[PDB]
Amino acid sequence: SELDQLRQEAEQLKNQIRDARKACADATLSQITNNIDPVGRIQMRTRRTLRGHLAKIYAMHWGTDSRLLVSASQDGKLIIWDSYTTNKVHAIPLRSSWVMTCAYAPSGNYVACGGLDNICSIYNLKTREGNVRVSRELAGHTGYLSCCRFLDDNQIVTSSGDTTCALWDIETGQQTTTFTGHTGDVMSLSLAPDTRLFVSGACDASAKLWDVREGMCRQTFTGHESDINAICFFPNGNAFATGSDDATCRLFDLRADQELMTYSHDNIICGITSVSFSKSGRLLLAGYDDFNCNVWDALKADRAGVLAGHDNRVSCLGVTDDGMAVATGSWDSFLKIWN
Amino acid sequence: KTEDQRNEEKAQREANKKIEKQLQKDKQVYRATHRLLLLGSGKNTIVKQMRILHTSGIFETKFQVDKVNFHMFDVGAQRDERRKWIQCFNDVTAIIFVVASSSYQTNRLQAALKLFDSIWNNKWLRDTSVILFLNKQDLLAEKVLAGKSKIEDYFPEFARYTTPEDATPEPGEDPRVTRAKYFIRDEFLRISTASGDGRHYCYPHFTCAVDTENIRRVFNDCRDIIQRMHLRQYELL
């Protein structure tokens, strides 16, 4: 009775949205991005290799000063690195050995940490007492942490493993707003440069744009075919690229609500773990699954380079806010800085 | 103003020395332990036996058998979509797989078989190995003796199956329950030797609900796992 007519209304709505997508697709950028000459071969060498972690390194993040970085590994240790002089500033021990996310606050005072313990532990880097002391502890969800980012010092947004995303206040330690629209568990969420929207990608082969004010969805991008693993905004804030385990990386656009350009090769056989861009947004980097990582040109789908320096996975990869370094994480407990 | 940044890097080097000293202190602590994952099915009974012998997302147990310390991690408050959080547990020495070997979801045994299949054929668990437990074989004996819920009507291979030569004797053993229990073993080893080649192996052992030697049995299994990994690195096997 109700279920079949609801399903046929959903099908009619989906057909209408597909027609609306097809109406505004007057052209593709494959015939418009060929005019600018390609960047050619791009080769970069391991400048510094930060050694000292034991287990697999799952996530890293840079700082606002583009000088300090945080690495979280599965041995239960979080290390603040000094990327200029290969130095270790702090080595924070963790309550849970398994972590898959770490964050650096924009004010440089806090480091967030989370993992399979269903707890986002946030530490304090300032003040004159001995060592590093955990300030708050957020536990209000029923699934494993996947990735967490900082809005500012006052709030933090977390992507969870129970098909939910949550916005957490710091002082009260409560969920201000929750984002429940996904059907599979969410891994990667990336914040817009204006700190007002974010897009979260899950294992339902789709990514959803949100707001942090009203707490509802905006777009429902469906253009993939497997579990989306990583996501990262353009520096301009009107496009974003996702990379799934289907060995393809796809770039979407916020304004036309269509997938713009995909990158694929026949020899590419392994999925995507991490995706980050450059300062100009021209050169996007995809941490791959076949024991190395790659460079894409993001206007025309051409492989402009390759970086191969790992004996294992490329679990995470980040690029500084200034753009003078490319950082990579790996399962062979080694961080490398490329320039 | 050279002295200011000079003693700044001096203090930075001192902090580096202290942090590296602490890291080297904890490196032996990390490498001196062995990590085990418990997976499901009677897991509560065997972990209670572990606690007698010795909603958070991860539960903590500690062993101290024979002056070797073991990590055992049992998962909870997590969804059944276990495809992407199990990639963390690849550096563990062994994944303990407890299977309720009496419930034959309409069939629990087939679900156990493809959970084993997905663990075996995954592209990140090839290095790690599995210790298999056929828990709840006491009710298996009563179900075999009843004969109203026979494995024959849910398995066509049981009609033509023959008993292996390696029979384990224990007084008052029904031949039919031994035949069924070793067929249940063989169903798991078909998957185990379908693709397992040198890198990892299965260790199929049978425990009741009142057994107590599971600690020493997991001890021996980790011993053989470390020995086989070392022997494969020596090109000796």
Epitope: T163, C203, A205, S226 | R79, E81, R82, Q105, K114
Partner: nanobody, 128 residues
Framework: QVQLQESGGGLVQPGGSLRLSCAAS????????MNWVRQAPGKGLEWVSD????????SYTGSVKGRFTISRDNAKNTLYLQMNSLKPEDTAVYYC?????????????????????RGQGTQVTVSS
């Protein structure tokens, strides 16, 4: 978009024949081995049969083999079941489940209570 729309299904007599046909669109078909999962009225999800990427390795459960045969035509983007010697205890809603990863032998969370790459489901009822 990724979707799986399947057809067939109806009230048939025991021991009859019924071609449970399933169709797909979007994703490529040469990779992505696909299984069959059924859920009985009053029971959880259970697996029936699976096929490989090329179509060489076919396996079935205990209550299905020798009676039901599955097949895949990757040119026509169609994979279907074949019901023969149909038992009264096989009534269920059948889902055209799909493995989440390209060309990996392992297949995870096919029988999960919530899933993304799974069909809506067609109901087959068998009775006298």
């Amino acid at each position: 978009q990724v979707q799986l729309q399947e057809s067939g299904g109806g009230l048939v007599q025991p021991g009859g024949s019924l071609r449970l046909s399933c169709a797909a669109s979007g994703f490529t078909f040469s990779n992505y081995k696909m299984n069959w999962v059924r859920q009985a009225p009053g029971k959880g999800l259970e697996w029936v049969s699976d096929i490989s990427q090329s179509g060489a390795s076919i396996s079935y459960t205990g209550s299905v083999k020798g009676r039901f045969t599955i097949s895949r035509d990757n040119a026509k983007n169609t994979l279907y079941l074949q019901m023969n010697s149909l038992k009264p205890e096989d009534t269920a809603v059948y889902y055209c489940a799909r493995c989440p990863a390209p060309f990996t032998r392992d297949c995870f969370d096919v029988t999960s209570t919530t899933y993304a790459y799974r069909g809506q489901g067609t109901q087959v009822t068998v009775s006298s």
